Amino acid sequence: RDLDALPASYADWQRRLRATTDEARPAAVEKRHAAGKLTARENVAALLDAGSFNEHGALALAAQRGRRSEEELLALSPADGLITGVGTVNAGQFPDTAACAVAAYDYTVLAGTQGYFNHHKLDRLIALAGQWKWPLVLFAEGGGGRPGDTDMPVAAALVTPTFLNFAALSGQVPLVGVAAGACFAGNAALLGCCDVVIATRDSSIGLGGPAMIEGGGLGVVAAGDIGPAEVLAQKGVVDLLAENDAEANELARRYLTYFQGDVTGWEAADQRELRWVIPQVRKRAYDVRALLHLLADTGSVLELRRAFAPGLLTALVRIGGKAFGVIANDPAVLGGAIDAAGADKAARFLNLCDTHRLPVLSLVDTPGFMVGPASEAEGAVRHVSRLFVRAAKLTVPFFAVVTRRAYGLGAQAMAAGSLHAPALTVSWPGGEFGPMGLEGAVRLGREALYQKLVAQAYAQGEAVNVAAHLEVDAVIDPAETRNWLLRALRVSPYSAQRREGGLVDPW
Amino acid sequence: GGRPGDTDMPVAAALVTPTFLNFAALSGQVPLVGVAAGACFAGNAALLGCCDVVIATRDSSIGLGGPAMIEGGGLGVVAAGDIGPAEVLAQKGV
Amino acid sequence: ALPASYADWQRRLRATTDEARPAAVEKRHAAGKLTARENVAALLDAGSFNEHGALALAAQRGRRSEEELLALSPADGLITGVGTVNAGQFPDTAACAVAAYDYTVLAGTQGYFNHHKLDRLIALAGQWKWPLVLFAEGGGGRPGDTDMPVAAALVTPTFLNFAALSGQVPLVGVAAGACFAGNAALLGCCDVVIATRDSSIGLGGPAMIEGGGLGVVAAGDIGPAEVLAQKGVVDLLAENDAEANELARRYLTYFQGDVTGWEAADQRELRWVIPQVRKRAYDVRALLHLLADTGSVLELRRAFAPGLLTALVRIGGKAFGVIANDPAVLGGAIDAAGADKAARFLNLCDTHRLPVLSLVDTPGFMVGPASEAEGAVRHVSRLFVRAAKLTVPFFAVVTRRAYGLGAQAMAAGSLHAPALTVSWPGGEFGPMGLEGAVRLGYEALYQKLVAQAYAQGEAVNVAAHLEVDAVIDPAETRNWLLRALRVSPYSAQRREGGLVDPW
Amino acid sequence: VLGGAIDAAGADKAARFLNLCDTHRLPVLSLVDTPGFMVGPASEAEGAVRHVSRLFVRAAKLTVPFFAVVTRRAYGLGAQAMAAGSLHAPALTV
Amino acid sequence: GGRPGDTDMPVAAALVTPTFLNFAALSGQVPLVGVAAGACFAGNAALLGCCDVVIATRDSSIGLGGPAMIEGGGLGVVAAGDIGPAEVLAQKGV
């Protein structure tokens, strides 16, 4: 009985446990690091706080005992290629809301494929995550269903509940998906059900891998690669585009902070600069992202889904340490008009914020909904209707700041249905309101009478007159925006409970 | 869509109208049936798009902007007919 | 500096300030009154105010220049917004909405735009649970808002939506002058009505009175606050605008949570406030100020039904609502008006989640044909019906007399209805009244039977029969209550669809 | 009686009756023929401001159907109170 | 009870089977009727014991362990019919 030693019977367990470590698999780690990539174990170590990890199923092996020796399986399939457990994330800043489940496929184990045992491993984590409300971070790198788990009898294997039970977590807990490499079939199915999709630039994502496609050799010269992260970002599948595994890992940690509570020690730029971001000349464009970074807490801006529907910006930010979701028109894209894709992007982001109980700020500078036969052929009538239907069901505080233009139903949709739907609606002094392009409206409805009617219509749509008719709550100094928003939020009580049976629509 | 000549009432921009939000709020509470039998533009189309089902006659044209609204900003000349033909919008899921 | 385009906005914004209207401020101060802007500044903490609709003007753009409207109708005569009140002491429960009519702007009348201003404030207050303070001074509906054509204009939901806030949030009404028609309608729906002595409140103004055939009344005489205090319409009678404003802040503190740094008198004084000699009266308000934390007593509705006292107080920093019989009025008997006052006060405390203390010193319900002709049977039943639905802690302290059904009503239905019922050593209990009881049932034998009945009603024998939980030293009253409240958990949530009945 | 005016007692009678019907789940019909609330110093001394406020406070919390039929006169705040707060408060106002 | 020889798997200890927990979870949700008509041992009796009512024929034998399980650890050679006769178990409240 030596307390500085272990009983000799622990040897076999310690041996099998070492076989799962990166240290015991140098060849695999080297090939991984040679590509500038992280191992599955390294992703768990970078995500979770040290010493917090309760691992489930570490000693698991591939369901191929009938074909392989015990020693061959141990070298072939440590953890059966999936690391599952629960720890804490960002516990230094959020000690009371740091719970975090993790599921990380190991691509060096059978191409990160989904086998019999690692399916059950993920099933158990899903069940616990739903019962105990664990946020779940999924590193989905892998090639889909595994061929050759011969130990267990099956016919078609279409009973697997993993994808349904994982999808059921939507609306219950934050779901973070990280794709760092190949991510096909069932691996991609899980990814698509997450609140946010982070993908490295070198990633390829699809419902079917190269083998399932059978486009052949050279199929790629004409068709292109299956799902390059850069394309999928433009098509709205990838929300955050990372340059490397480490950055994709950090983006998972960053993303979660917005759902872990308030922050202290925040900073803010000189708010007087907001008076000069938008030119006093009409039409002359400006950088909306510059305006947002001035308005938001220093360093708190995490824009989501930028490449998709770029006419409408969506970002998680902080104002006074308080987590906000922001929607904003980019006047540099389509004049800031709201098209079918912009409505989807805005609607789903409202879904995200309302489900996870974050307030929403809307920066309005839009000429309204896009129009014309090309727009209608994109289904614009239905897609913009997402906004009114979603905004009518919000149960979080909603604040609207008209920075410049606010025209038509599109402007009303940006303000959650109307300029009085928000808990607070303010205009900057340069605000111009009305329906549709004011110059074109009046003349279709020689120089002296036209300029008379134009000037009266602009004067009727001026911020001061719109406010005098109570359509906005106030005209404010742009430098006072944060104060107005924080004072309003301070007196905007709402429930922190998530609605039972709610969900975050993947689109 | 919106009527331009209602001069009796004082207005600035008239963007406080809750009709479109309150109509969309009925979704999930009751069945909402949308019937478009002709031209259906702007706010008229907004209400239609929020319904559970959209019924349209083949001669209907549906869009978020009428001809005047389309020329009002860049996209030049289009007749009402060609803005959003029901047969096209049927293919595009509207 | 500011971009040159801000010039127009800044110009119209200055026009709303008292600085830009010296005459209006001066007319106001000459009368010892505050302007609407000053009421907001005095109520709310500096820098906390989000104002909605400051740039609004009267709906008379067809009759007047914009420059004339700017001088005639800044803010359209109504200041609306949300800030904080008493945030120094209550940082986490300081939200406060305010709507203050400006009498120097079109006689504080209710016009088209300021109606919508108040509509938006009511909707936001109800959704975000803002307490709302209304300075209701004004002459009612405005004649001359010609920009909007109307028929009868009887769809205006302002009064229904404001009344709907009752039971959702605290509603404080301040009347500092003339308050007629719709202005008085809003006021009457508040939890508490504060009025200066120079106020006159009614459902109809002088024109409305003479226009309905009832002759030539001056505004002053329609409904003087001093008279209306006796009639139960005015709950707090202020000497001037400034005191009325202060009374609004004080009233709200009781609904903002517990307090620290409190003080209390020498509780042994409570042994000597009530005479050992029967019949001998005492000052109940002196007793109350000894019991409650020093300076925490705010009596409500004193002029009305003075036989039954109602007051918000603090004990050990904890907010209490207190009801108590005044033995100096009607012998402390409970009449119809005292029942209304008590019932409505229980409504207030239960709705806004305050514990209730009852100081019992009553001969019971008033009797006689005159009392029955005041509807006594119905009015006193409100006590049992109200008390049967309480969901707050209720404590009863019998300081002296406790006779009959009235005493049971003072104890929320019976001496066992409260979570704690204690008697001071001089507690005397019984029915109807002991001297009449013996005489009606049957000189030296009479004095024998009376003394036996009083001995049967002695505190010790009543406690021995378990009708009260204990007989206590009066100096230990605060301790017994605070120990009891500490183990009296209850929901701080307000009831959905609840209300505070204006009567 | 009193020209059909609504005084403090009439508000108490009506309010408590609404309480009864709403509590025991009966629909309410209102037959409106009133010049409005009683006015004058004698009325105000009956506590009219508080007593008539009961109608607005009561009607705002109704959860039964309320219908208003204006048979003739409908004047002032009193008529609005007879219609459960405003002419649009009832489920049907004719 | 538990079947030996289902070699298609294999298993380690096979102590994860949720059948007995999930069957017992039906208690209080729906009526549960258990009928024993013969030998009823180990997991078979575990399900039976969780029912609202247990109906057993006289010729039944019910127990948590069959003859093999009994002889498997100490308690010698009992016959199947002797393990838990319905008549005995009726007297003992099973």
Tab-separated table of N, CA, C and O in Angstrom, chain C residues 204-292:
chain	number	residue	atom	x	y	z
C	204	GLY	N	-66.736	67.216	-15.376
C	204	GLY	CA	-67.177	68.252	-16.287
C	204	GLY	C	-66.670	69.623	-15.892
C	204	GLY	O	-66.735	70.000	-14.717
C	205	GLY	N	-66.153	70.374	-16.862
C	205	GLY	CA	-65.690	71.718	-16.615
C	205	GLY	C	-66.828	72.716	-16.589
C	205	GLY	O	-67.997	72.400	-16.862
C	206	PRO	N	-66.488	73.967	-16.259
C	206	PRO	CA	-67.527	75.014	-16.185
C	206	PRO	C	-68.424	75.078	-17.414
C	206	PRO	O	-69.652	75.172	-17.286
C	207	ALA	N	-67.838	75.035	-18.611
C	207	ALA	CA	-68.646	75.042	-19.825
C	207	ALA	C	-69.550	73.818	-19.886
C	207	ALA	O	-70.722	73.915	-20.268
C	208	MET	N	-69.023	72.654	-19.499
C	208	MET	CA	-69.815	71.432	-19.511
C	208	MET	C	-70.952	71.495	-18.500
C	208	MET	O	-72.030	70.944	-18.743
C	209	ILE	N	-70.732	72.160	-17.367
C	209	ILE	CA	-71.770	72.272	-16.347
C	209	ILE	C	-72.872	73.216	-16.818
C	209	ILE	O	-74.050	72.847	-16.869
C	210	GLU	N	-72.502	74.454	-17.161
C	210	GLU	CA	-73.484	75.406	-17.665
C	210	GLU	C	-74.116	74.920	-18.961
C	210	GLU	O	-75.280	75.233	-19.241
C	211	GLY	N	-73.373	74.150	-19.759
C	211	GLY	CA	-73.905	73.623	-21.004
C	211	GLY	C	-74.915	72.512	-20.813
C	211	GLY	O	-75.726	72.266	-21.712
C	212	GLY	N	-74.879	71.833	-19.670
C	212	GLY	CA	-75.864	70.835	-19.316
C	212	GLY	C	-76.976	71.350	-18.432
C	212	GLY	O	-77.727	70.542	-17.873
C	213	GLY	N	-77.098	72.666	-18.271
C	213	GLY	CA	-78.202	73.254	-17.551
C	213	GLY	C	-77.966	73.499	-16.078
C	213	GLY	O	-78.807	74.139	-15.435
C	214	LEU	N	-76.858	73.014	-15.517
C	214	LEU	CA	-76.602	73.129	-14.086
C	214	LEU	C	-75.954	74.457	-13.694
C	214	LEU	O	-75.389	74.552	-12.596
C	215	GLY	N	-76.018	75.477	-14.547
C	215	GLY	CA	-75.675	76.824	-14.142
C	215	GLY	C	-74.192	77.152	-14.164
C	215	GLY	O	-73.347	76.439	-14.712
C	216	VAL	N	-73.888	78.279	-13.519
C	216	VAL	CA	-72.605	78.961	-13.659
C	216	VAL	C	-71.770	78.612	-12.432
C	216	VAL	O	-71.870	79.252	-11.383
C	217	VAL	N	-70.920	77.601	-12.563
C	217	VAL	CA	-69.951	77.267	-11.525
C	217	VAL	C	-68.580	77.766	-11.958
C	217	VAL	O	-68.216	77.691	-13.139
C	218	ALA	N	-67.820	78.283	-11.001
C	218	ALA	CA	-66.433	78.629	-11.250
C	218	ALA	C	-65.573	77.374	-11.172
C	218	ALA	O	-65.910	76.413	-10.473
C	219	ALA	N	-64.456	77.384	-11.900
C	219	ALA	CA	-63.586	76.215	-11.922
C	219	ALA	C	-63.173	75.828	-10.510
C	219	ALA	O	-63.283	74.661	-10.115
C	220	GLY	N	-62.694	76.797	-9.733
C	220	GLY	CA	-62.392	76.596	-8.331
C	220	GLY	C	-63.389	75.739	-7.579
C	220	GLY	O	-62.993	74.847	-6.826
C	221	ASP	N	-64.685	75.994	-7.772
C	221	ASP	CA	-65.724	75.406	-6.937
C	221	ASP	C	-66.255	74.065	-7.441
C	221	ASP	O	-67.077	73.450	-6.750
C	222	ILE	N	-65.823	73.581	-8.607
C	222	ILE	CA	-66.424	72.361	-9.150
C	222	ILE	C	-66.137	71.173	-8.235
C	222	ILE	O	-67.053	70.454	-7.820
C	223	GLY	N	-64.865	70.947	-7.914
C	223	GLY	CA	-64.482	69.843	-7.066
C	223	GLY	C	-63.209	70.128	-6.294
C	223	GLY	O	-62.135	69.593	-6.592
C	224	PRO	N	-63.306	70.981	-5.278
C	224	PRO	CA	-62.108	71.364	-4.521
C	224	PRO	C	-61.423	70.150	-3.912
C	224	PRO	O	-62.064	69.295	-3.299
C	225	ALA	N	-60.100	70.088	-4.081
C	225	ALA	CA	-59.333	68.960	-3.559
C	225	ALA	C	-59.590	68.751	-2.073
C	225	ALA	O	-59.661	67.611	-1.601
C	226	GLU	N	-59.729	69.845	-1.318
C	226	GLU	CA	-59.964	69.730	0.117
C	226	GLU	C	-61.290	69.035	0.402
C	226	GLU	O	-61.381	68.196	1.308
C	227	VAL	N	-62.329	69.364	-0.367
C	227	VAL	CA	-63.607	68.670	-0.242
C	227	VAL	C	-63.473	67.226	-0.709
C	227	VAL	O	-63.929	66.294	-0.041
C	228	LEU	N	-62.854	67.023	-1.874
C	228	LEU	CA	-62.754	65.685	-2.447
C	228	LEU	C	-61.921	64.744	-1.581
C	228	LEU	O	-62.114	63.525	-1.653
C	229	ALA	N	-61.013	65.277	-0.761
C	229	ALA	CA	-60.291	64.438	0.189
C	229	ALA	C	-61.243	63.818	1.205
C	229	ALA	O	-61.129	62.631	1.531
C	230	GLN	N	-62.192	64.607	1.719
C	230	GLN	CA	-63.201	64.055	2.616
C	230	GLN	C	-64.075	63.036	1.907
C	230	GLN	O	-64.527	62.067	2.528
C	231	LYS	N	-64.344	63.245	0.620
C	231	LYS	CA	-65.235	62.382	-0.141
C	231	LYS	C	-64.530	61.160	-0.712
C	231	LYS	O	-65.153	60.397	-1.459
C	232	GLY	N	-63.251	60.961	-0.390
C	232	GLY	CA	-62.538	59.765	-0.786
C	232	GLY	C	-61.986	59.770	-2.192
C	232	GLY	O	-61.490	58.732	-2.645
C	233	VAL	N	-62.046	60.897	-2.897
C	233	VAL	CA	-61.487	60.978	-4.243
C	233	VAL	C	-59.996	61.284	-4.203
C	233	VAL	O	-59.219	60.732	-4.990
C	234	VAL	N	-59.581	62.169	-3.302
C	234	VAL	CA	-58.183	62.552	-3.145
C	234	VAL	C	-57.594	61.770	-1.981
C	234	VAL	O	-58.120	61.817	-0.860
C	235	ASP	N	-56.489	61.066	-2.237
C	235	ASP	CA	-55.857	60.234	-1.219
C	235	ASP	C	-54.792	60.980	-0.429
C	235	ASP	O	-54.626	60.710	0.768
C	236	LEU	N	-54.066	61.901	-1.067
C	236	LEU	CA	-52.998	62.661	-0.427
C	236	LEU	C	-53.177	64.137	-0.748
C	236	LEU	O	-53.219	64.519	-1.922
C	237	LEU	N	-53.266	64.957	0.289
C	237	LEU	CA	-53.552	66.379	0.150
C	237	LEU	C	-52.254	67.153	0.355
C	237	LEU	O	-51.703	67.168	1.460
C	238	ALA	N	-51.777	67.793	-0.708
C	238	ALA	CA	-50.511	68.509	-0.695
C	238	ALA	C	-50.741	70.006	-0.537
C	238	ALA	O	-51.760	70.549	-0.974
C	239	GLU	N	-49.770	70.672	0.087
C	239	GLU	CA	-49.833	72.119	0.228
C	239	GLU	C	-49.502	72.827	-1.077
C	239	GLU	O	-50.063	73.894	-1.352
C	240	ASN	N	-48.606	72.264	-1.887
C	240	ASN	CA	-48.157	72.928	-3.105
C	240	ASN	C	-47.658	71.888	-4.101
C	240	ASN	O	-47.533	70.701	-3.786
C	241	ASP	N	-47.367	72.365	-5.316
C	241	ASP	CA	-46.906	71.480	-6.383
C	241	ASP	C	-45.667	70.700	-5.959
C	241	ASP	O	-45.579	69.489	-6.186
C	242	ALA	N	-44.703	71.379	-5.330
C	242	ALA	CA	-43.449	70.726	-4.967
C	242	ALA	C	-43.679	69.585	-3.986
C	242	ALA	O	-43.078	68.513	-4.122
C	243	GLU	N	-44.537	69.796	-2.982
C	243	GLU	CA	-44.820	68.733	-2.025
C	243	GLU	C	-45.545	67.573	-2.697
C	243	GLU	O	-45.275	66.404	-2.396
C	244	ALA	N	-46.477	67.876	-3.603
C	244	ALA	CA	-47.163	66.825	-4.341
C	244	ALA	C	-46.172	65.989	-5.138
C	244	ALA	O	-46.279	64.757	-5.181
C	245	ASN	N	-45.194	66.646	-5.770
C	245	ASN	CA	-44.169	65.929	-6.516
C	245	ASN	C	-43.355	65.032	-5.591
C	245	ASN	O	-43.095	63.865	-5.909
C	246	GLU	N	-42.960	65.558	-4.431
C	246	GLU	CA	-42.219	64.760	-3.463
C	246	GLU	C	-43.050	63.579	-2.977
C	246	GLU	O	-42.523	62.479	-2.782
C	247	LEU	N	-44.352	63.788	-2.775
C	247	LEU	CA	-45.217	62.712	-2.303
C	247	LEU	C	-45.327	61.585	-3.322
C	247	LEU	O	-45.549	60.430	-2.942
C	248	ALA	N	-45.185	61.895	-4.610
C	248	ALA	CA	-45.168	60.848	-5.624
C	248	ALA	C	-43.942	59.958	-5.461
C	248	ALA	O	-44.046	58.726	-5.505
C	249	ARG	N	-42.769	60.567	-5.260
C	249	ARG	CA	-41.546	59.793	-5.063
C	249	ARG	C	-41.639	58.926	-3.815
C	249	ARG	O	-41.316	57.733	-3.850
C	250	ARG	N	-42.062	59.518	-2.695
C	250	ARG	CA	-42.177	58.762	-1.449
C	250	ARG	C	-43.113	57.574	-1.616
C	250	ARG	O	-42.807	56.459	-1.180
C	251	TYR	N	-44.274	57.804	-2.233
C	251	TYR	CA	-45.237	56.730	-2.437
C	251	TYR	C	-44.605	55.558	-3.177
C	251	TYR	O	-44.834	54.396	-2.825
C	252	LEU	N	-43.795	55.844	-4.199
C	252	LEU	CA	-43.228	54.782	-5.025
C	252	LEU	C	-42.181	53.963	-4.274
C	252	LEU	O	-42.009	52.774	-4.574
C	253	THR	N	-41.478	54.565	-3.302
C	253	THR	CA	-40.426	53.839	-2.589
C	253	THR	C	-40.960	52.566	-1.953
C	253	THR	O	-40.265	51.544	-1.920
C	254	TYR	N	-42.190	52.605	-1.439
C	254	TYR	CA	-42.753	51.438	-0.768
C	254	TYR	C	-42.901	50.249	-1.707
C	254	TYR	O	-43.022	49.114	-1.234
C	255	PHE	N	-42.882	50.484	-3.020
C	255	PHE	CA	-43.048	49.434	-4.018
C	255	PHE	C	-41.743	49.087	-4.717
C	255	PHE	O	-41.760	48.346	-5.705
C	256	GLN	N	-40.613	49.576	-4.208
C	256	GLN	CA	-39.315	49.392	-4.841
C	256	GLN	C	-38.393	48.464	-4.061
C	256	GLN	O	-37.261	48.243	-4.497
C	257	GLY	N	-38.827	47.933	-2.926
C	257	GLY	CA	-38.074	46.924	-2.207
C	257	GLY	C	-37.679	47.382	-0.816
C	257	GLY	O	-38.085	48.444	-0.332
C	258	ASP	N	-36.868	46.550	-0.166
C	258	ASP	CA	-36.479	46.773	1.218
C	258	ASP	C	-35.478	47.923	1.321
C	258	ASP	O	-34.892	48.373	0.333
C	259	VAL	N	-35.268	48.372	2.557
C	259	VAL	CA	-34.433	49.523	2.858
C	259	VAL	C	-33.496	49.172	4.009
C	259	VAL	O	-33.796	48.309	4.841
C	260	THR	N	-32.348	49.849	4.049
C	260	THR	CA	-31.381	49.714	5.128
C	260	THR	C	-31.116	51.077	5.756
C	260	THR	O	-31.431	52.122	5.179
C	261	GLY	N	-30.522	51.057	6.947
C	261	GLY	CA	-30.226	52.283	7.661
C	261	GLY	C	-31.387	52.851	8.438
C	261	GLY	O	-31.322	54.004	8.883
C	262	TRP	N	-32.450	52.076	8.607
C	262	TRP	CA	-33.639	52.517	9.316
C	262	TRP	C	-33.358	52.695	10.808
C	262	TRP	O	-32.393	52.163	11.360
C	263	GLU	N	-34.229	53.465	11.460
C	263	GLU	CA	-34.152	53.716	12.891
C	263	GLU	C	-35.534	53.538	13.503
C	263	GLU	O	-36.548	53.507	12.801
C	264	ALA	N	-35.567	53.422	14.830
C	264	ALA	CA	-36.819	53.210	15.539
C	264	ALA	C	-36.716	53.792	16.940
C	264	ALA	O	-35.650	53.778	17.560
C	265	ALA	N	-37.844	54.301	17.432
C	265	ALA	CA	-37.915	54.861	18.771
C	265	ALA	C	-37.748	53.768	19.826
C	265	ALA	O	-37.672	52.575	19.523
C	266	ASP	N	-37.698	54.199	21.086
C	266	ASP	CA	-37.636	53.280	22.221
C	266	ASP	C	-38.958	52.525	22.323
C	266	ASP	O	-39.978	53.094	22.725
C	267	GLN	N	-38.944	51.239	21.971
C	267	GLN	CA	-40.189	50.483	21.875
C	267	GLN	C	-40.878	50.306	23.218
C	267	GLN	O	-42.060	49.949	23.248
C	268	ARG	N	-40.180	50.550	24.329
C	268	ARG	CA	-40.838	50.494	25.628
C	268	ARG	C	-41.918	51.557	25.760
C	268	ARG	O	-42.821	51.408	26.591
C	269	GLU	N	-41.859	52.610	24.942
C	269	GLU	CA	-42.902	53.629	24.954
C	269	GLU	C	-44.261	53.038	24.613
C	269	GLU	O	-45.296	53.585	25.016
C	270	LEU	N	-44.285	51.927	23.871
C	270	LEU	CA	-45.547	51.318	23.473
C	270	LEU	C	-46.308	50.733	24.653
C	270	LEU	O	-47.517	50.496	24.540
C	271	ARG	N	-45.632	50.491	25.778
C	271	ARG	CA	-46.309	50.008	26.975
C	271	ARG	C	-47.176	51.079	27.615
C	271	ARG	O	-48.059	50.747	28.414
C	272	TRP	N	-46.950	52.348	27.276
C	272	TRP	CA	-47.578	53.463	27.961
C	272	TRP	C	-48.411	54.348	27.047
C	272	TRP	O	-48.927	55.372	27.507
C	273	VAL	N	-48.561	53.990	25.772
C	273	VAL	CA	-49.366	54.815	24.883
C	273	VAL	C	-50.851	54.556	25.102
C	273	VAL	O	-51.669	55.475	24.977
C	274	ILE	N	-51.236	53.330	25.434
C	274	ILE	CA	-52.637	52.979	25.650
C	274	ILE	C	-52.904	52.977	27.153
C	274	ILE	O	-52.260	52.207	27.885
C	275	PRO	N	-53.825	53.803	27.649
C	275	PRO	CA	-54.072	53.865	29.095
C	275	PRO	C	-54.519	52.532	29.671
C	275	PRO	O	-55.304	51.799	29.065
C	276	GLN	N	-54.024	52.233	30.876
C	276	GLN	CA	-54.558	51.123	31.652
C	276	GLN	C	-56.004	51.376	32.064
C	276	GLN	O	-56.726	50.423	32.378
C	277	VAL	N	-56.428	52.637	32.068
C	277	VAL	CA	-57.803	53.014	32.380
C	277	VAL	C	-58.657	52.835	31.131
C	277	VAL	O	-58.376	53.428	30.084
C	278	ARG	N	-59.710	52.024	31.238
C	278	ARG	CA	-60.649	51.873	30.134
C	278	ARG	C	-61.342	53.201	29.842
C	278	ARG	O	-61.344	54.126	30.660
C	279	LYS	N	-61.939	53.284	28.652
C	279	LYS	CA	-62.646	54.480	28.197
C	279	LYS	C	-61.670	55.565	27.748
C	279	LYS	O	-61.941	56.289	26.785
C	280	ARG	N	-60.547	55.694	28.453
C	280	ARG	CA	-59.580	56.746	28.172
C	280	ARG	C	-59.004	56.580	26.773
C	280	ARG	O	-58.391	55.555	26.461
C	281	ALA	N	-59.201	57.592	25.931
C	281	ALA	CA	-58.737	57.528	24.556
C	281	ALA	C	-57.237	57.810	24.480
C	281	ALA	O	-56.593	58.198	25.456
C	282	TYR	N	-56.685	57.607	23.287
C	282	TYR	CA	-55.270	57.827	23.032
C	282	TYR	C	-55.115	58.189	21.565
C	282	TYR	O	-56.044	58.036	20.768
C	283	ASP	N	-53.924	58.669	21.208
C	283	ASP	CA	-53.616	59.012	19.822
C	283	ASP	C	-53.073	57.767	19.134
C	283	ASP	O	-51.950	57.335	19.415
C	284	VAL	N	-53.873	57.189	18.234
C	284	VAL	CA	-53.434	55.999	17.511
C	284	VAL	C	-52.262	56.335	16.599
C	284	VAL	O	-51.347	55.524	16.418
C	285	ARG	N	-52.272	57.534	16.004
C	285	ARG	CA	-51.186	57.925	15.110
C	285	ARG	C	-49.874	58.068	15.868
C	285	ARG	O	-48.801	57.850	15.294
C	286	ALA	N	-49.937	58.405	17.158
C	286	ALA	CA	-48.729	58.400	17.977
C	286	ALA	C	-48.207	56.983	18.163
C	286	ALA	O	-46.995	56.745	18.108
C	287	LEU	N	-49.115	56.030	18.394
C	287	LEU	CA	-48.735	54.626	18.488
C	287	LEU	C	-48.064	54.163	17.201
C	287	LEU	O	-46.993	53.543	17.228
C	288	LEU	N	-48.678	54.471	16.057
C	288	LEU	CA	-48.153	54.012	14.772
C	288	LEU	C	-46.742	54.535	14.524
C	288	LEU	O	-45.871	53.796	14.050
C	289	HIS	N	-46.494	55.811	14.834
C	289	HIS	CA	-45.176	56.387	14.594
C	289	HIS	C	-44.132	55.829	15.550
C	289	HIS	O	-42.939	55.816	15.220
C	290	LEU	N	-44.552	55.373	16.734
C	290	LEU	CA	-43.631	54.664	17.622
C	290	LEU	C	-43.278	53.292	17.063
C	290	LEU	O	-42.119	52.866	17.131
C	291	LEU	N	-44.264	52.592	16.501
C	291	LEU	CA	-44.050	51.229	16.028
C	291	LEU	C	-43.223	51.208	14.744
C	291	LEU	O	-42.288	50.410	14.611
C	292	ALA	N	-43.557	52.070	13.787
C	292	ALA	CA	-42.915	52.034	12.483
C	292	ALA	C	-41.524	52.662	12.541
C	292	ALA	O	-41.194	53.426	13.450
